[PDB]
Nucleic acid binder design. Structure first.
Ligand SMILES: C[C@H](Cn1cnc2c(N)ncnc21)OCP(=O)(O)N[C@H](CC(=O)O)C(=O)O
Ligand SMILES: [Mn+2]
Ligand SMILES: [Mn+2]
Lengths: 411, 555
DNA sequence: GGTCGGCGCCCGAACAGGGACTG
DNA sequence: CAGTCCCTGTTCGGGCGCCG
């Protein structure tokens, strides 16, 4: 008996037409059960080939979670509805969420099934279930309610969400609550004990309105990865050659980097392994360059209208560095991960973990997901990444092939 | 016209486009008799109806003889209607493979006669399926019909039939969950672990359940005894194989004859191990005419004769036992070619295959092995829904050195080393630290965009020097040429310092094959060395001899 | 005597995006 | 400075194979 919010695609665009990729046996059996149950509850209904639209579908398990979770790759549909969830029903991003001692994430995607979807828009939510060895043709469905993973679901449900959280926000006015996709971010400066208790207060407060899992974050302990120069007492020709090449690359970010006095030490055609004593003017040029790298870059600030971009570098030995920026060399944040799941054995699992951590940080800090530049071959990534995905959202990505230059971001 | 028991699928035309209006082709008198004989039989059965002048549309029509039968097949040239019909989403996601079938107690295969002619078409869309059957006389106006069912030649018919067929089988499959029904169009592979007595009943029940909707299962196409002919294979109780393959024996080969040969070779590669089409595919490059005669090279005749000798011996595949592991083993055939066998018991292949794609201008065996593993993985997930365990001709230590030091992310699933030459290995290793006691070559190269002239050379710490003039070259080619010079003129250990990102990026990927002969010569020199240390320095910064050698190669 | 859909392979042409040099 | 071009990688069009 609920009225539907009319939704339109971006003018001049059509719906998504993305082929379904192969799924493993465990994922298909998980999808068949979920879709059969969702069909019995009227959340989805079968359709036919007269619907030219289609969106890929697979399944995941969250961290330390046994239950399978249906996940739709609505990335292409979210691009073709961008003016809806940013112009009309935009959700504000609290700048204080990143400043809280503890932030917890709550999967509230189950609440979207309560609200029906606009009848004219259901044609674009179509998805197909494959079968092992193509025993049967594809089993096509479409959504009758607000789908999970679609950027229009939290916008339509925002009005209902604000009225559900009003009793809790009043009693706890110092707690920040941010909603992004199927997740709910709850941040507070409370002690770890009573913080999780306030989370359970919100869990029971949400259960009485027809709705569980929690992941803890600590944005106050997030540290950046600066550019560091080696501290050696005996330098060689090769050491100084690598030092100048690194400082030359870093000069594109810090305009005050000078390499003249250090280059003068490399005047002759010397052997790489020859020890070179640093002159007086070179030592001062190195000490001054170290101080500039301590300074923040001039004229760097987040722009709400520009897209976020994230680059990741493989440093070996489980080390992974990353930088987030909107304009080149104007990095809004840099960092480094180490000893993640799959270290010293699985690069794709480590890279998948890195993309998730970086995306989670970008949601807390700016409320946006960055477009990733992945140091991996396209076929290597598209073959394994779903085996390790553990998040209800999916960021956009492209594949790069940049051979290592002068190891700028890691010693 | 009576209402068909099957729910119709609503179909619209694309917005702003009308139906087709095409004139009929001149048909042979032998094909006209077959059409009128079929048209009058379908009109009696309510599948087509007459139309007058109120239908302003028309579409050509023809016929093709059925395989191993005297019956005919009515086809429509709906090429103009498909352009203006709405887009569909195909529900056929792939082709079933017999290596995915599991052993069942009883197996039954049955076809559906005139499958498209038993599924209704949308009422509002029948007007656009108008055609004219020419009579034996050119002056006779001819009979005009319109389709009441799914035509043959319309882009919506296959997607509609497969979706319609799946909906009819759902109530039967729901009542009989332990009965496997492979549904490829109208071909039904039915197998079960029930006793053969109860199996014949369930088949008759299915033949009655399909009959309640207009789907006829003729006893002619019924198959109760092995070997079953299914999807172009021969299914036996313990094994399977492809139906006999005939390769053309042309004395004078054309371009189209090679395409027909290459296709059947790829088709045979699914069970016949060791098929190579590298040299034969080298005949299709740079050619323009399909009917152009092309002579066979010495490498193509040897490859063709080897494929024929493989097809002489009978090969067969087995079925999938879900209780035992899935194993895939890869071998390095020729340069750029790979074959694999997927099995569970030794020498009992489920299927075979080959990978031979050339990705990029610079590659190595380790990259191509990773590409073959990924191709087999995706193929296995389609067929079996799981990734097989790999046996690879690469040392565990070799692969460890590669993926840990590579700048890209790369990974191979659970695998074990199999000692079967030729083994995949890295042919040279760049040092991580500069070499003490090794000569240090500062290399550089430059060229002019207009004159296409340039210089390549080096300057070392021992005063050694060289500059070579280069004609018809580029900046990138000279900088590779400078590294090649320092490799020729150095000892077994060398330190090379360049400012070429392009040159350093190629070499650090440790290639062993390249489309550039210059890179191949660099590779050949790198394998002769014992310790090579490359290093990059920025240009135009007055660094070492890199500035001195930059001014030497300026012109 | 030339229809449709699906999947696979092989090829070349068209498309595209980064790096070093030049007016 | 933007303009090329030298190089490399990707996507897509079109032929065959095979199935219904
Ligand atoms: C019509 C469907 C699919 N289908 C098969 N061939 C087709 C073709 N050339 N064009 C378009 N659709 C085609 O198949 C039903 P069918 O009547 O059971 N099978 C025979 C095939 C034979 O036995 O040779 C036939 O249709 O001729
Ligand atoms: Mn049939
Ligand atoms: Mn140069």
């Amino acid at each position: 008996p609920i009225e539907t919010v009319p939704v339109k695609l971006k003018p001049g665009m059509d719906g998504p037409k993305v082929k379904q990729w192969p799924l493993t046996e465990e994922k298909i059996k998980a999808l068949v059960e979920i879709c059969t149950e969702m069909e019995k509850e009227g959340k989805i209904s079968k359709i036919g080939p007269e619907n030219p639209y289609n969106t890929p579908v697979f399944a995941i398990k969250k961290k330390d979670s046994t239950k399978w979770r249906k996940l739709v790759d609505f990335r292409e549909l979210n691009k073709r509805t961008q003016d809806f969830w940013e112009v009309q029903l935009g959700i504000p991003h609290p700048a204080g969420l990143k400043k809280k001692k503890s932030v917890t994430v709550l999967d509230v995607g189950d609440a979207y099934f309560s609200v029906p979807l606009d009848e004219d828009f259901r044609k674009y939510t179509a998805f197909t279930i494959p079968s092992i060895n193509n025993e049967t043709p594809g089993i096509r469905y479409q959504y009758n309610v607000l789908p999970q993973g679609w950027k229009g679901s939290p916008a339509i449900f925002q009005s209902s969400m604000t009225k559900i959280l009003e009793p809790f926000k009043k009693q706890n006015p110092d707690i920040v609550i941010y909603q992004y996709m199927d997740d709910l971010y709850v941040g507070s400066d409370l002690e770890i004990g009573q913080h999780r208790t306030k989370i359970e207060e919100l869990r029971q407060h949400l259960l009485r309105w027809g709705l569980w899992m929690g992941y803890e974050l600590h944005p106050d302990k997030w540290t950046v990865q600066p550019i560091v120069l080696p501290e050696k007492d005996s330098w060689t020709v090769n050491d100084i050659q690598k030092l100048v090449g690194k400082l030359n690359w870093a000069s594109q970010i810090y305009p005050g980097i000078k390499v003249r006095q250090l280059s003068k030490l490399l005047r002759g055609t010397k052997a790489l392994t020859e020890v070179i004593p640093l002159t007086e003017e070179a030592e001062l040029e190195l000490a001054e360059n170290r101080e500039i790298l301590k300074e923040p870059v001039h004229g760097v600030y987040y722009d709400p209208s520009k897209d976020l971009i994230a680059e990741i570098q493989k440093q070996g030995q489980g080390q992974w560095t990353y930088q987030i920026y909107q304009e080149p060399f104007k990095n809004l944040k840099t960092g480094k991960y180490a000893r993640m799941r799959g270290a010293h054995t699985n690069d794709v699992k480590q890279l998948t973990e890195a993309v998730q951590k970086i995306t989670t940080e970008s949601i807390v800090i700016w409320g946006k997901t960055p477009k990733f530049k992945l140091p991996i071959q396209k076929e290597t990534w598209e073959t394994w990444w779903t085996e390790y995905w553990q998040a209800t959202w999916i960021p956009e990505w492209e594949f790069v092939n940049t051979p290592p230059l002068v190891k700028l971001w890691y010693q | 016209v009576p209402i068909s028991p099957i729910e119709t699928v609503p179909v619209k035309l694309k917005p702003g486009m009308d139906g087709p209006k095409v004139k009929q082709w001149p048909l042979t008198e032998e094909k006209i008799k077959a059409l009128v004989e079929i048209c009058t039989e379908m009109e009696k059965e309510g599948k087509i109806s007459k139309i007058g002048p109120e239908n302003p549309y028309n579409t050509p029509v023809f016929a093709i003889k059925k395989k191993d039968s005297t019956k005919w097949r009515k086809l429509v040239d709906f090429r103009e209607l498909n352009k203006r019909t709405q887009d569909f989403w195909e529900v056929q996601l792939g082709i079933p493979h017999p290596a995915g079938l599991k052993k069942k107690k009883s197996v039954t295969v049955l076809d559906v006669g005139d499958a498209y002619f038993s599924v209704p078409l949308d009422e509002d869309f029948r007007k656009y399926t108008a055609f004219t059957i020419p009579s034996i006389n050119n002056e006779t106006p001819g009979i005009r019909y319109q389709y009441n069912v799914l035509p043959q030649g319309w882009k919506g018919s296959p997607a509609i039939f497969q979706s319609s067929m799946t909906k009819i089988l759902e109530p039967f499959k729901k009542q009989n969950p332990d009965i496997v029904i492979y549904q490829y169009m109208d071909d039904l592979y039915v197998g079960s672990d029930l006793e053969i007595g109860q199996h014949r009943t369930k088949i008759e029940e299915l033949r009655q359940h399909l009959l309640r909707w207009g789907l006829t299962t003729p006893d002619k196409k019924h198959q109760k005894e092995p070997p079953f002919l299914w999807m172009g294979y021969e299914l036996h109780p313990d094994k399977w194989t492809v139906q006999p393959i005939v390769l053309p024996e042309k004395d004078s080969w054309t371009v189209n004859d090679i395409c027909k040969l290459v296709g059947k070779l790829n088709w045979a590669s699914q069970i016949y191990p060791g098929i190579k089409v590298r040299q034969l595919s080298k005949l299709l490059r740079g050619t323009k005419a399909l009917t152009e005669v092309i002579p066979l090279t010495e490498e193509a005749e040897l490859e063709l004769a080897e494929n024929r000798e493989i097809l002489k011996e009978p090969v067969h595949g087995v079925y999938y036992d879900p209780s035992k592991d899935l194993i895939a083993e890869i071998q390095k055939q020729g340069q750029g070619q790979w074959t694999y066998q997927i099995y569970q018991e030794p020498f009992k292949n489920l299927k075979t295959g080959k990978y031979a794609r050339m990705r990029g201008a610079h590659t190595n065996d380790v990259k191509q092995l990773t590409e073959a593993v990924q191709k087999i993985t995706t193929e296995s997930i389609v067929i079996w829904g799981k990734t097989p365990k790999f046996k690879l001709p690469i040392q565990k230590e070799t692969w460890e050195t590669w993926w840990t030091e590579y700048w890209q992310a790369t990974w191979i699933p659970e695998w074990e080393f199999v000692n079967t030459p030729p083994l995949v290995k890295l042919w040279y290793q760049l040092e991580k630290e500069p070499i003490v006691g090794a000569e240090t070559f500062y290399v550089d190269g430059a060229a002019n965009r207009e004159t296409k002239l340039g210089k390549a050379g080096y300057v070392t710490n021992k005063g050694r020097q060289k500059v070579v003039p280069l004609t018809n070259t580029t900046n990138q080619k000279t900088e590779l040429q400078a590294i090649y010079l320092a490799l020729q003129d150095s000892g077994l250990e060398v330190n090379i310092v360049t400012n070429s990102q392009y040159a350093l990026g190629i070499i650090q990927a440790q290639p062993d094959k390249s489309e550039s002969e210059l890179v191949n010569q660099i590779i050949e020199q790198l394998i002769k060395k014992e310790k090579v240390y490359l290093a990059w320095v920025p240009a135009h910064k007055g660094i070492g001899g890199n500035e001195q050698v930059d001014k030497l190669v300026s012109a």
